[PDB]
Amino acid sequence: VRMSVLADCLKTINNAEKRGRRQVLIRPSSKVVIKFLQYMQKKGYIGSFEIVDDHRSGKIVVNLLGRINKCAVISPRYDVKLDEIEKIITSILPSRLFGHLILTTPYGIMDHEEARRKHTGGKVLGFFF
Amino acid sequence: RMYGKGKGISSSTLPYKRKQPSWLKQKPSEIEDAIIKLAKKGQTPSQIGATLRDNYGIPQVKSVTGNKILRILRAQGIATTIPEDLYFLIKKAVSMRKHLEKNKKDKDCKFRLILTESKIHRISRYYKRKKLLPSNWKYQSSTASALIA
Amino acid sequence: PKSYRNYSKTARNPKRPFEKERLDQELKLIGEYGLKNKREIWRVQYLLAKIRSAARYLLTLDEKSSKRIFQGEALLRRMVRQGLLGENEEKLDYVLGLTLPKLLERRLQTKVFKLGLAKSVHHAR
Protein backbone atom coordinates (compact mmCIF):
# COMPACT_ATOMS: atom_id res chain seq x y z
CA VAL A 1 0.00 0.00 0.00
CA ARG A 2 1.61 3.36 1.12
CA MET A 3 5.06 2.42 2.38
CA SER A 4 6.89 5.72 1.70
CA VAL A 5 4.49 8.62 1.96
CA LEU A 6 7.32 10.96 1.08
CA ALA A 7 8.13 9.27 -2.21
CA ASP A 8 4.49 9.40 -3.26
CA CYS A 9 4.29 13.08 -2.35
CA LEU A 10 7.40 13.86 -4.37
CA LYS A 11 6.01 11.97 -7.37
CA THR A 12 2.78 13.96 -7.11
CA ILE A 13 4.74 17.20 -6.97
CA ASN A 14 6.75 16.20 -10.03
CA ASN A 15 3.56 15.38 -11.92
CA ALA A 16 2.09 18.75 -10.98
CA GLU A 17 5.23 20.51 -12.18
CA LYS A 18 5.09 18.63 -15.48
CA ARG A 19 1.47 19.62 -16.04
CA GLY A 20 2.21 23.18 -14.97
CA ARG A 21 -0.30 23.34 -12.13
CA ARG A 22 0.35 26.03 -9.44
CA GLN A 23 -1.30 24.27 -6.55
CA VAL A 24 -1.02 20.60 -5.58
CA LEU A 25 -2.54 18.54 -2.82
CA ILE A 26 0.07 16.34 -1.18
CA ARG A 27 -2.22 13.97 0.52
CA PRO A 28 -0.59 12.47 3.60
CA SER A 29 1.68 15.00 5.27
CA SER A 30 4.54 13.68 7.30
CA LYS A 31 7.07 15.45 9.49
CA VAL A 32 9.81 14.29 7.11
CA VAL A 33 7.86 15.47 4.07
CA ILE A 34 7.27 18.85 5.72
CA LYS A 35 10.99 19.16 6.43
CA PHE A 36 11.79 18.30 2.82
CA LEU A 37 9.32 20.91 1.59
CA GLN A 38 10.86 23.52 3.88
CA TYR A 39 14.31 22.70 2.54
CA MET A 40 13.03 23.04 -1.02
CA GLN A 41 11.48 26.40 -0.17
CA LYS A 42 14.77 27.58 1.33
CA LYS A 43 16.57 26.83 -1.95
CA GLY A 44 13.80 28.54 -3.92
CA TYR A 45 12.16 25.70 -5.82
CA ILE A 46 8.80 25.82 -4.05
CA GLY A 47 6.55 28.70 -2.88
CA SER A 48 4.27 28.75 0.18
CA PHE A 49 2.42 25.64 1.37
CA GLU A 50 -0.49 25.35 3.73
CA ILE A 51 -0.16 22.18 5.75
CA VAL A 52 -3.88 21.76 6.54
CA ASP A 53 -4.49 19.91 9.78
CA ASP A 54 -7.40 17.49 9.66
CA HIS A 55 -7.61 15.27 12.67
CA ARG A 56 -5.55 12.58 10.99
CA SER A 57 -2.52 12.45 8.68
CA GLY A 58 -2.76 16.03 7.42
CA LYS A 59 -2.99 17.21 3.83
CA ILE A 60 -0.57 19.71 2.48
CA VAL A 61 -1.41 21.85 -0.45
CA VAL A 62 1.65 23.44 -1.95
CA ASN A 63 2.26 26.51 -4.07
CA LEU A 64 4.59 25.93 -7.04
CA LEU A 65 6.77 28.56 -8.78
CA GLY A 66 7.12 26.66 -12.10
CA ARG A 67 10.74 26.15 -11.17
CA ILE A 68 11.37 22.45 -10.38
CA ASN A 69 12.70 20.28 -13.26
CA LYS A 70 12.36 17.09 -11.26
CA CYS A 71 12.19 16.13 -7.64
CA ALA A 72 12.45 12.62 -6.34
CA VAL A 73 13.03 10.15 -3.62
CA ILE A 74 15.88 7.63 -3.82
CA SER A 75 14.41 4.68 -1.97
CA PRO A 76 16.53 2.31 -0.25
CA ARG A 77 17.60 5.07 2.07
CA TYR A 78 21.19 3.99 1.72
CA ASP A 79 23.33 4.91 4.63
CA VAL A 80 25.99 7.07 2.99
CA LYS A 81 29.40 7.94 4.44
CA LEU A 82 30.88 11.42 3.91
CA ASP A 83 33.52 10.11 1.46
CA GLU A 84 30.96 8.04 -0.44
CA ILE A 85 28.78 11.16 -1.13
CA GLU A 86 30.63 12.60 -4.11
CA LYS A 87 30.23 9.55 -6.34
CA ILE A 88 26.54 9.32 -5.45
CA ILE A 89 25.98 12.95 -6.35
CA THR A 90 27.84 12.49 -9.64
CA SER A 91 25.59 9.52 -10.41
CA ILE A 92 22.41 11.42 -9.55
CA LEU A 93 22.14 15.11 -10.13
CA PRO A 94 22.70 16.87 -13.39
CA SER A 95 25.57 19.24 -12.63
CA ARG A 96 27.99 19.89 -9.82
CA LEU A 97 26.91 23.56 -10.02
CA PHE A 98 23.26 22.85 -9.06
CA GLY A 99 20.56 20.47 -7.88
CA HIS A 100 20.40 19.18 -4.30
CA LEU A 101 20.79 15.76 -2.78
CA ILE A 102 18.97 15.61 0.48
CA LEU A 103 20.24 13.52 3.32
CA THR A 104 18.70 12.77 6.60
CA THR A 105 21.63 13.29 8.88
CA PRO A 106 21.82 13.17 12.70
CA TYR A 107 21.89 17.00 12.40
CA GLY A 108 18.45 17.03 10.74
CA ILE A 109 17.78 16.77 7.01
CA MET A 110 20.09 18.80 4.78
CA ASP A 111 21.63 18.80 1.32
CA HIS A 112 24.90 17.21 0.25
CA GLU A 113 26.80 20.50 0.37
CA GLU A 114 25.47 21.15 3.87
CA ALA A 115 26.53 17.67 4.96
CA ARG A 116 30.01 18.26 3.56
CA ARG A 117 30.24 21.55 5.44
CA LYS A 118 29.15 19.86 8.66
CA HIS A 119 31.12 16.61 8.36
CA THR A 120 28.36 14.03 8.75
CA GLY A 121 26.90 12.06 5.94
CA GLY A 122 23.76 10.03 6.70
CA LYS A 123 20.85 8.31 4.94
CA VAL A 124 19.88 9.67 1.56
CA LEU A 125 16.24 10.74 1.14
CA GLY A 126 15.98 12.34 -2.28
CA PHE A 127 16.83 15.16 -4.64
CA PHE A 128 15.83 17.98 -6.99
CA PHE A 129 17.17 19.88 -10.02
CA ARG B 1 -10.10 -5.50 0.40
CA MET B 2 -7.87 -8.15 2.00
CA TYR B 3 -9.20 -11.09 0.01
CA GLY B 4 -11.58 -10.30 -2.85
CA LYS B 5 -10.88 -7.96 -5.69
CA GLY B 6 -13.26 -5.57 -3.89
CA LYS B 7 -11.95 -2.00 -3.79
CA GLY B 8 -14.79 -0.02 -2.22
CA ILE B 9 -14.27 2.83 0.25
CA SER B 10 -17.62 2.98 2.06
CA SER B 11 -16.72 4.23 5.50
CA SER B 12 -17.70 6.05 8.63
CA THR B 13 -15.72 9.29 8.85
CA LEU B 14 -15.96 11.21 12.08
CA PRO B 15 -16.40 14.98 12.34
CA TYR B 16 -13.57 17.44 12.92
CA LYS B 17 -14.86 18.55 16.32
CA ARG B 18 -13.92 15.85 18.86
CA LYS B 19 -14.97 17.66 22.05
CA GLN B 20 -18.64 16.68 22.39
CA PRO B 21 -21.25 18.94 20.74
CA SER B 22 -23.26 21.51 22.74
CA TRP B 23 -26.64 19.75 22.48
CA LEU B 24 -25.41 16.55 24.22
CA LYS B 25 -27.09 16.59 27.69
CA GLN B 26 -26.06 13.13 28.96
CA LYS B 27 -23.48 13.13 31.75
CA PRO B 28 -20.74 10.47 31.34
CA SER B 29 -21.77 8.25 34.24
CA GLU B 30 -25.27 7.74 32.85
CA ILE B 31 -23.90 6.83 29.44
CA GLU B 32 -21.46 4.38 31.02
CA ASP B 33 -24.34 2.76 32.89
CA ALA B 34 -26.34 2.52 29.66
CA ILE B 35 -23.38 0.90 27.91
CA ILE B 36 -23.03 -1.62 30.72
CA LYS B 37 -26.73 -2.45 30.50
CA LEU B 38 -26.44 -2.95 26.74
CA ALA B 39 -23.45 -5.25 27.23
CA LYS B 40 -25.39 -7.28 29.79
CA LYS B 41 -28.32 -7.57 27.38
CA GLY B 42 -26.06 -9.55 24.97
CA GLN B 43 -24.91 -6.84 22.55
CA THR B 44 -21.37 -6.73 21.19
CA PRO B 45 -19.20 -3.56 21.12
CA SER B 46 -20.06 -2.40 17.61
CA GLN B 47 -23.73 -3.20 18.11
CA ILE B 48 -23.71 -1.38 21.45
CA GLY B 49 -22.18 1.68 19.81
CA ALA B 50 -24.82 1.59 17.08
CA THR B 51 -27.58 1.35 19.67
CA LEU B 52 -26.14 4.31 21.56
CA ARG B 53 -26.00 6.36 18.36
CA ASP B 54 -29.56 5.54 17.36
CA ASN B 55 -31.82 4.95 20.39
CA TYR B 56 -30.12 7.44 22.69
CA GLY B 57 -28.87 10.84 21.62
CA ILE B 58 -25.12 10.33 21.51
CA PRO B 59 -22.76 10.25 18.55
CA GLN B 60 -19.48 8.92 19.96
CA VAL B 61 -18.83 7.48 23.39
CA LYS B 62 -15.24 8.76 22.95
CA SER B 63 -16.36 12.42 23.00
CA VAL B 64 -18.72 12.08 25.98
CA THR B 65 -16.52 9.70 27.93
CA GLY B 66 -12.73 10.10 27.52
CA ASN B 67 -12.59 6.31 26.96
CA LYS B 68 -13.73 4.19 24.02
CA ILE B 69 -16.47 1.64 24.67
CA LEU B 70 -14.39 -1.55 24.68
CA ARG B 71 -12.10 0.06 27.26
CA ILE B 72 -15.02 0.93 29.49
CA LEU B 73 -16.41 -2.60 29.16
CA ARG B 74 -13.01 -3.95 30.20
CA ALA B 75 -12.94 -1.59 33.18
CA GLN B 76 -16.40 -2.77 34.21
CA GLY B 77 -15.23 -6.38 33.67
CA ILE B 78 -17.84 -7.50 31.11
CA ALA B 79 -15.28 -7.78 28.29
CA THR B 80 -15.39 -10.97 26.24
CA THR B 81 -12.44 -13.36 26.49
CA ILE B 82 -12.63 -13.71 22.72
CA PRO B 83 -12.56 -10.37 20.76
CA GLU B 84 -15.53 -9.20 18.69
CA ASP B 85 -14.27 -9.44 15.12
CA LEU B 86 -12.38 -12.66 15.78
CA TYR B 87 -15.45 -14.19 17.40
CA PHE B 88 -17.57 -13.23 14.41
CA LEU B 89 -15.04 -14.79 12.05
CA ILE B 90 -15.02 -17.98 14.08
CA LYS B 91 -18.82 -18.12 13.97
CA LYS B 92 -18.75 -17.71 10.21
CA ALA B 93 -16.16 -20.47 9.90
CA VAL B 94 -18.27 -22.78 12.05
CA SER B 95 -21.30 -22.10 9.87
CA MET B 96 -19.27 -22.84 6.74
CA ARG B 97 -18.00 -26.09 8.22
CA LYS B 98 -21.53 -27.21 9.08
CA HIS B 99 -22.58 -26.56 5.48
CA LEU B 100 -19.58 -28.50 4.20
CA GLU B 101 -20.44 -31.42 6.48
CA LYS B 102 -24.02 -31.39 5.22
CA ASN B 103 -23.19 -30.73 1.63
CA LYS B 104 -19.83 -32.04 0.47
CA LYS B 105 -19.65 -30.95 -3.18
CA ASP B 106 -19.75 -27.14 -2.56
CA LYS B 107 -16.39 -25.98 -3.94
CA ASP B 108 -16.94 -22.23 -3.71
CA CYS B 109 -17.93 -22.57 -0.05
CA LYS B 110 -14.82 -24.61 0.65
CA PHE B 111 -12.66 -21.98 -1.03
CA ARG B 112 -14.30 -19.25 1.03
CA LEU B 113 -13.97 -21.35 4.18
CA ILE B 114 -10.22 -21.54 3.56
CA LEU B 115 -10.08 -17.76 3.19
CA THR B 116 -11.98 -17.24 6.43
CA GLU B 117 -9.67 -19.68 8.22
CA SER B 118 -6.67 -17.74 6.93
CA LYS B 119 -8.18 -14.47 8.10
CA ILE B 120 -8.86 -15.94 11.54
CA HIS B 121 -5.26 -17.08 11.73
CA ARG B 122 -4.12 -13.54 10.93
CA ILE B 123 -6.49 -11.96 13.44
CA SER B 124 -5.75 -14.70 15.96
CA ARG B 125 -2.02 -14.15 15.54
CA TYR B 126 -2.44 -10.42 16.05
CA TYR B 127 -4.41 -10.97 19.24
CA LYS B 128 -1.78 -13.39 20.52
CA ARG B 129 0.89 -10.78 19.81
CA LYS B 130 -1.06 -8.46 22.10
CA LYS B 131 -2.57 -10.18 25.18
CA LEU B 132 -6.27 -10.53 24.33
CA LEU B 133 -5.89 -14.16 23.37
CA PRO B 134 -3.73 -16.52 25.41
CA SER B 135 -0.65 -17.91 23.60
CA ASN B 136 -2.21 -21.37 24.09
CA TRP B 137 -4.97 -20.88 21.51
CA LYS B 138 -4.64 -22.30 17.99
CA TYR B 139 -8.20 -22.29 16.66
CA GLN B 140 -9.21 -25.84 15.78
CA SER B 141 -11.74 -26.94 13.15
CA SER B 142 -12.82 -29.69 15.57
CA THR B 143 -13.20 -27.44 18.66
CA ALA B 144 -14.22 -24.14 16.98
CA SER B 145 -17.98 -24.68 17.40
CA ALA B 146 -17.68 -24.86 21.21
CA LEU B 147 -15.32 -21.86 21.39
CA ILE B 148 -17.75 -19.05 20.34
CA ALA B 149 -19.92 -19.28 23.50
CA PRO C 1 62.97 -14.88 -4.73
CA LYS C 2 61.85 -12.31 -7.31
CA SER C 3 63.45 -8.90 -7.16
CA TYR C 4 61.48 -6.09 -5.64
CA ARG C 5 62.50 -3.63 -8.36
CA ASN C 6 59.02 -2.71 -9.48
CA TYR C 7 58.42 -1.38 -12.98
CA SER C 8 55.58 0.34 -14.83
CA LYS C 9 54.03 0.95 -18.21
CA THR C 10 54.61 4.52 -19.29
CA ALA C 11 52.18 4.55 -22.25
CA ARG C 12 48.67 3.29 -22.90
CA ASN C 13 47.65 2.51 -26.53
CA PRO C 14 44.71 4.24 -28.21
CA LYS C 15 41.47 2.15 -28.02
CA ARG C 16 40.19 2.88 -31.52
CA PRO C 17 43.25 2.33 -33.71
CA PHE C 18 42.11 3.70 -37.13
CA GLU C 19 40.12 6.80 -36.23
CA LYS C 20 41.14 9.27 -38.94
CA GLU C 21 41.06 12.62 -37.15
CA ARG C 22 43.03 11.40 -34.15
CA LEU C 23 45.63 9.83 -36.43
CA ASP C 24 45.99 13.06 -38.37
CA GLN C 25 46.41 15.02 -35.14
CA GLU C 26 49.10 12.61 -33.97
CA LEU C 27 50.91 12.94 -37.29
CA LYS C 28 50.77 16.73 -37.04
CA LEU C 29 52.22 16.58 -33.54
CA ILE C 30 55.01 14.30 -34.75
CA GLY C 31 55.79 16.71 -37.58
CA GLU C 32 55.91 19.72 -35.40
CA TYR C 33 57.98 18.43 -32.52
CA GLY C 34 60.25 15.88 -34.30
CA LEU C 35 59.07 12.65 -32.61
CA LYS C 36 59.91 9.07 -33.62
CA ASN C 37 56.62 7.18 -33.08
CA LYS C 38 53.09 7.56 -31.91
CA ARG C 39 54.51 5.91 -28.80
CA GLU C 40 56.22 9.13 -27.73
CA ILE C 41 52.93 10.99 -28.07
CA TRP C 42 51.12 8.28 -26.13
CA ARG C 43 53.73 8.46 -23.36
CA VAL C 44 53.32 12.21 -23.10
CA GLN C 45 49.53 11.85 -23.06
CA TYR C 46 49.87 9.37 -20.20
CA LEU C 47 52.11 11.79 -18.33
CA LEU C 48 49.61 14.60 -18.89
CA ALA C 49 46.69 12.32 -18.19
CA LYS C 50 47.84 11.26 -14.72
CA ILE C 51 48.25 14.91 -13.75
CA ARG C 52 44.84 15.75 -15.19
CA SER C 53 43.24 12.90 -13.26
CA ALA C 54 44.86 14.13 -10.06
CA ALA C 55 43.59 17.65 -10.72
CA ARG C 56 40.08 16.34 -11.34
CA TYR C 57 40.17 14.38 -8.09
CA LEU C 58 41.35 17.46 -6.20
CA LEU C 59 38.56 19.55 -7.68
CA THR C 60 36.00 16.98 -6.50
CA LEU C 61 37.17 17.90 -2.94
CA ASP C 62 36.36 21.34 -1.50
CA GLU C 63 38.87 24.09 -0.65
CA LYS C 64 40.45 24.01 2.83
CA SER C 65 40.09 20.22 2.90
CA SER C 66 43.61 19.31 3.98
CA LYS C 67 44.28 16.87 1.16
CA ARG C 68 43.11 19.29 -1.51
CA ILE C 69 45.26 22.11 -0.20
CA PHE C 70 48.37 20.01 0.29
CA GLN C 71 48.39 17.60 -2.63
CA GLY C 72 46.78 20.09 -5.01
CA GLU C 73 49.33 22.72 -4.05
CA ALA C 74 52.16 20.25 -4.59
CA LEU C 75 50.78 19.38 -8.02
CA LEU C 76 50.57 23.05 -8.92
CA ARG C 77 54.16 23.59 -7.78
CA ARG C 78 55.33 20.64 -9.87
CA MET C 79 53.54 22.03 -12.91
CA VAL C 80 55.17 25.42 -12.37
CA ARG C 81 58.59 23.75 -12.09
CA GLN C 82 57.97 21.86 -15.32
CA GLY C 83 57.24 25.11 -17.23
CA LEU C 84 53.59 24.30 -17.85
CA LEU C 85 51.92 27.29 -16.16
CA GLY C 86 54.14 30.10 -14.79
CA GLU C 87 52.68 33.28 -13.26
CA ASN C 88 49.12 33.85 -14.54
CA GLU C 89 47.63 30.36 -14.56
CA GLU C 90 48.36 28.72 -11.20
CA LYS C 91 44.97 27.80 -9.69
CA LEU C 92 44.39 23.99 -10.19
CA ASP C 93 41.51 24.65 -12.60
CA TYR C 94 44.29 25.67 -15.03
CA VAL C 95 46.30 22.40 -14.80
CA LEU C 96 43.33 20.73 -16.47
CA GLY C 97 43.68 23.20 -19.37
CA LEU C 98 47.10 21.75 -20.30
CA THR C 99 47.24 20.10 -23.71
CA LEU C 100 49.94 18.10 -25.48
CA PRO C 101 51.63 21.12 -27.06
CA LYS C 102 52.30 22.57 -23.62
CA LEU C 103 54.12 19.38 -22.66
CA LEU C 104 55.96 18.88 -25.92
CA GLU C 105 57.26 22.47 -25.74
CA ARG C 106 59.24 21.47 -22.63
CA ARG C 107 60.95 18.48 -24.34
CA LEU C 108 64.63 19.09 -24.57
CA GLN C 109 64.80 18.84 -28.36
CA THR C 110 62.06 21.45 -28.74
CA LYS C 111 63.85 23.76 -26.32
CA VAL C 112 67.10 23.33 -28.27
CA PHE C 113 65.32 24.18 -31.50
CA LYS C 114 63.82 27.29 -29.90
CA LEU C 115 67.08 28.59 -28.36
CA GLY C 116 69.03 28.74 -31.63
CA LEU C 117 71.55 25.86 -31.54
CA ALA C 118 70.10 23.90 -34.50
CA LYS C 119 68.28 24.92 -37.73
CA SER C 120 65.51 22.29 -37.23
CA VAL C 121 63.71 20.02 -34.75
CA HIS C 122 65.10 16.88 -36.38
CA HIS C 123 68.58 18.43 -36.37
CA ALA C 124 68.22 19.29 -32.69
CA ARG C 125 67.21 15.71 -31.91
Binding site: S75, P76, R77, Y78 | - | -
Partner: protein, 144 residues
Protein backbone atom coordinates in the same frame (compact mmCIF):
# COMPACT_ATOMS: atom_id res chain seq x y z
CA UNK D 1 7.50 -1.19 -9.42
CA UNK D 2 10.94 -2.35 -10.71
CA UNK D 3 10.66 -6.15 -10.75
CA UNK D 4 13.63 -6.54 -8.43
CA UNK D 5 13.38 -5.99 -4.67
CA UNK D 6 14.90 -2.76 -3.54
CA UNK D 7 14.73 -3.18 0.20
CA UNK D 8 17.59 -2.14 2.42
CA UNK D 9 17.78 -5.64 3.85
CA UNK D 10 17.08 -7.27 0.52
CA UNK D 11 20.57 -8.37 -0.36
CA UNK D 12 20.04 -12.13 -0.08
CA UNK D 13 17.35 -12.20 -2.72
CA UNK D 14 19.33 -9.91 -5.00
CA UNK D 15 22.46 -12.01 -4.80
CA UNK D 16 20.64 -15.29 -5.10
CA UNK D 17 18.64 -14.41 -8.20
CA UNK D 18 21.80 -13.18 -9.89
CA UNK D 19 23.63 -16.37 -8.95
CA UNK D 20 20.89 -18.51 -10.47
CA UNK D 21 20.50 -16.35 -13.56
CA UNK D 22 24.12 -15.92 -14.46
CA UNK D 23 23.83 -19.47 -15.87
CA UNK D 24 21.46 -18.27 -18.61
CA UNK D 25 24.34 -16.24 -20.02
CA UNK D 26 25.82 -18.53 -22.65
CA UNK D 27 29.37 -17.21 -22.35
CA UNK D 28 29.35 -17.49 -18.56
CA UNK D 29 28.08 -21.06 -18.80
CA UNK D 30 30.83 -21.92 -21.27
CA UNK D 31 33.42 -20.51 -18.90
CA UNK D 32 32.11 -22.10 -15.64
CA UNK D 33 30.64 -25.52 -16.49
CA UNK D 34 33.05 -28.43 -15.89
CA UNK D 35 32.26 -29.98 -19.31
CA UNK D 36 34.84 -27.56 -20.81
CA UNK D 37 37.76 -29.78 -19.68
CA UNK D 38 35.95 -33.04 -20.49
CA UNK D 39 34.40 -32.17 -23.87
CA UNK D 40 37.20 -30.29 -25.65
CA UNK D 41 40.17 -31.75 -27.54
CA UNK D 42 42.74 -29.19 -26.42
CA UNK D 43 41.48 -29.65 -22.83
CA UNK D 44 41.82 -25.95 -22.03
CA UNK D 45 44.93 -25.10 -24.04
CA UNK D 46 46.11 -22.81 -26.82
CA UNK D 47 47.52 -25.46 -29.11
CA UNK D 48 48.00 -29.20 -29.23
CA UNK D 49 50.35 -31.64 -30.91
CA UNK D 50 48.81 -34.27 -33.09
CA UNK D 51 50.26 -36.73 -35.54
CA UNK D 52 48.33 -36.74 -38.80
CA UNK D 53 46.06 -39.65 -39.71
CA UNK D 54 44.42 -38.51 -42.99
CA UNK D 55 44.88 -35.71 -45.54
CA UNK D 56 41.22 -35.03 -46.44
CA UNK D 57 39.02 -32.61 -48.41
CA UNK D 58 35.96 -30.88 -46.97
CA UNK D 59 33.33 -29.34 -49.25
CA UNK D 60 32.41 -25.76 -48.25
CA UNK D 61 29.04 -24.19 -47.19
CA UNK D 62 26.47 -24.05 -50.03
CA UNK D 63 26.88 -20.49 -51.41
CA UNK D 64 30.65 -20.80 -51.78
CA UNK D 65 32.16 -23.61 -53.79
CA UNK D 66 35.45 -25.06 -52.72
CA UNK D 67 36.98 -28.20 -51.31
CA UNK D 68 38.99 -27.00 -48.35
CA UNK D 69 42.06 -29.05 -47.51
CA UNK D 70 41.91 -30.48 -44.01
CA UNK D 71 44.00 -32.90 -42.07
CA UNK D 72 42.40 -35.36 -39.69
CA UNK D 73 44.87 -35.57 -36.80
CA UNK D 74 45.18 -37.43 -33.53
CA UNK D 75 46.16 -35.43 -30.46
CA UNK D 76 49.08 -36.95 -28.54
CA UNK D 77 47.88 -35.30 -25.34
CA UNK D 78 44.31 -36.58 -25.44
CA UNK D 79 43.94 -39.39 -28.04
CA UNK D 80 41.33 -37.24 -29.80
CA UNK D 81 40.70 -37.28 -33.58
CA UNK D 82 40.05 -33.81 -35.06
CA UNK D 83 40.02 -32.16 -38.50
CA UNK D 84 42.33 -29.21 -38.79
CA UNK D 85 42.18 -26.98 -41.81
CA UNK D 86 45.54 -26.26 -43.34
CA UNK D 87 46.08 -22.70 -44.66
CA UNK D 88 48.21 -21.69 -47.68
CA UNK D 89 47.67 -21.84 -51.44
CA UNK D 90 49.36 -25.24 -51.62
CA UNK D 91 50.14 -26.27 -48.10
CA UNK D 92 48.46 -29.67 -47.82
CA UNK D 93 51.39 -31.20 -49.72
CA UNK D 94 53.93 -29.37 -47.44
CA UNK D 95 52.94 -31.89 -44.70
CA UNK D 96 53.39 -35.68 -44.70
CA UNK D 97 50.62 -38.28 -44.17
CA UNK D 98 52.27 -38.94 -40.80
CA UNK D 99 53.87 -35.74 -39.43
CA UNK D 100 53.89 -34.33 -35.87
CA UNK D 101 51.60 -31.34 -36.46
CA UNK D 102 51.06 -28.50 -33.96
CA UNK D 103 47.50 -27.32 -34.25
CA UNK D 104 45.85 -24.18 -32.87
CA UNK D 105 42.31 -22.90 -32.62
CA UNK D 106 40.77 -21.15 -35.62
CA UNK D 107 39.92 -17.86 -33.90
CA UNK D 108 36.44 -18.41 -32.55
CA UNK D 109 37.02 -20.39 -29.37
CA UNK D 110 35.22 -23.70 -30.22
CA UNK D 111 32.82 -22.18 -32.75
CA UNK D 112 33.54 -23.07 -36.41
CA UNK D 113 34.90 -20.57 -38.93
CA UNK D 114 33.73 -19.23 -42.28
CA UNK D 115 33.09 -21.56 -45.20
CA UNK D 116 34.13 -24.69 -43.36
CA UNK D 117 31.57 -26.99 -41.75
CA UNK D 118 32.75 -28.08 -38.31
CA UNK D 119 36.52 -27.74 -38.56
CA UNK D 120 37.55 -25.72 -35.55
CA UNK D 121 41.30 -26.01 -35.85
CA UNK D 122 44.23 -24.60 -37.73
CA UNK D 123 47.43 -26.58 -38.12
CA UNK D 124 50.25 -24.08 -37.76
CA UNK D 125 53.51 -26.09 -37.55
CA UNK D 126 54.76 -29.32 -39.07
CA UNK D 127 57.92 -31.14 -37.98
CA UNK D 128 58.61 -27.98 -35.92
CA UNK D 129 58.78 -25.73 -39.04
CA UNK D 130 56.18 -23.00 -39.25
CA UNK D 131 53.49 -23.58 -41.85
CA UNK D 132 53.49 -19.83 -42.53
CA UNK D 133 57.25 -19.91 -43.09
CA UNK D 134 56.89 -22.79 -45.53
CA UNK D 135 54.14 -20.93 -47.39
CA UNK D 136 56.34 -17.85 -47.69
CA UNK D 137 59.21 -20.19 -48.63
CA UNK D 138 61.86 -17.44 -48.63
CA UNK D 139 62.11 -18.08 -44.87
CA UNK D 140 62.26 -21.89 -44.55
CA UNK D 141 62.10 -25.41 -46.01
CA UNK D 142 60.56 -28.51 -44.32
CA UNK D 143 63.25 -30.59 -42.59
CA UNK D 144 62.99 -34.39 -42.81
Amino acid sequence: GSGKPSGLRAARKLRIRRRTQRWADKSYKKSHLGTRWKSNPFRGSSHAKGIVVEKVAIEAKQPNSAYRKCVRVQLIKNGKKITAFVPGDGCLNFIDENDEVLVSGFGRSGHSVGDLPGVKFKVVKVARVSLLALFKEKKEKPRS
